[PDB]
Amino acid sequence: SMTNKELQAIRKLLMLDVSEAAEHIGRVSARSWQYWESGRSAVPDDVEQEMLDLASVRIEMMSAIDKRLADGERPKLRFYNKLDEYLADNPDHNVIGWRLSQSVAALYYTEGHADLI
């Protein structure tokens, strides 16, 4: 029962642009995605579940870094600012995985735990 504001919140947390979420998750125009965030139309079940699954991936990514911190390591995390460079290192990923990687790396940098390269 994700609301319009909850969709927007998770989309922003995952560092997706509207156009990226619209193209790949919604398979709709950016305008149609904006309508789900504005509440003009209900958030589709399939879109809700996909946002939740992507959040679960992000959690798995964080649990792994947490173990490195528990070991005393100060990780050097890749912050890719070029999609093509992310994809060259992750040939089976796409723009969604790129944004997830940014969200995770930014969290640990901002918390003071990791350095970005």
CA quadruple 88, 89, 94, 100: dihedral positive or negative? negative
Per-state percent for the chain, helix, strand, coil, to nearest 5 = 65, 5, 30
Q: Which does 111 bind (CB under 5 to 8 A by kind): Cl ion, Mg ion, a copy of itself, none?
A: a copy of itself
Binding string to Cl ion for residues 75 to 94, with x set by CB under 5 A, is what?
--xx----------------
What is the token pair recorded at 35?
């309508």
Nearer to a copy of itself, 28 or 55 (CB): 55
Given the structure tokens 């959040």, which residue do they identify? Answer: 55
Total Cβ atoms within 10 A of residue 39: 13
Nearer to Mg ion, 1 or 63 (CB): 1
Write out the residues near a copy of itself by the rule CB under 8 A: 3-6, 8-10, 12-15, 37-38, 55, 58-59, 79, 81, 102-103, 105-107, 109-112, 115-117
State the binding site for Mg(2+). Answer: 93
